[PDB]
Design a protein around this ligand. Structure first.
Ligand SMILES: Cc1cc2nc3c(=O)[nH]c(=O)nc-3n(C[C@H](O)[C@H](O)[C@H](O)COP(=O)(O)O)c2cc1C
Ligand SMILES: [Cl-]
Ligand SMILES: [Cl-]
Length: 156
């Protein structure tokens, strides 16, 4: 009952959630939301305020926002897509909490993201460098995500 695909994603304002729905449909994967214990408020997401929760977390590479629930088994999956918004050219720190809360061995892991304009390159490189034991697959920025842009990425 293995060899399945998981599409895991974090989304604060729904943009990455909609791109992840399109990815899950395109790969016939299980749609899974990475849930913070404390949801990000408008004040938390204030990029201009150096004291906002997101500003503090993104200034600290060791920050690990807690998850809402413990992670279930990932044994049934051989492929895991991980989606997120780009925050300050990086994956939000909850993505580090997620990766550090399960066993990703023997799995292909593919990052995808949405952004205001930044590329996924730095965010992806930092994930590869911090988790060199994972079989990273080439990631993709999915801005203005549609059934057609996602179909093209998956069909190659
Ligand atoms: C704290 C914070 C930092 C951000 N930093 C970046 C950035 O470095 N580059 C970028 O192009 N967009 C940046 N954005 C914009 C988001 O990546 C973009 O709006 C994303 O699509 C939001 O996705 P979501 O609705 O799934 O949460 C930032 C947004 C927030 C809240
Ligand atoms: Cl709010
Ligand atoms: Cl690793």
């Amino acid at each position: 009952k293995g060899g399945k695909t998981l599409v895991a994603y974090f989304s604060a304002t729904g943009t990455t959630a909609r791109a992840a729905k399109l990815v899950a449909e395109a790969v016939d994967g299980t749609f899974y939301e990475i849930q913070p214990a404390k949801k990000y408020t408008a004040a938390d997401l204030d990029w201009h305020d150096k004291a906002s929760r997101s500003s503090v977390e993104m200034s600290d590479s060791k920050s690990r926002p807690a998850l809402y629930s413990k992670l279930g088994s990932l044994a049934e999956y051989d492929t895991i897509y991980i989606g997120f918004p780009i925050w300050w050219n990086l994956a939000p720190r909850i993505i580090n909490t997620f990766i550090e809360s399960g066993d990703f061995a023997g799995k292909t892991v593919i990052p995808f993201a949405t952004s205001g304009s930044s590329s996924i390159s730095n965010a992806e490189k930092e994930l590869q460098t911090n988790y060199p034991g994972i079989n990273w697959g080439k990631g993709r920025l999915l801005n203005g995500a549609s059934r057609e842009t996602v179909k093209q990425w998956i069909k190659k």
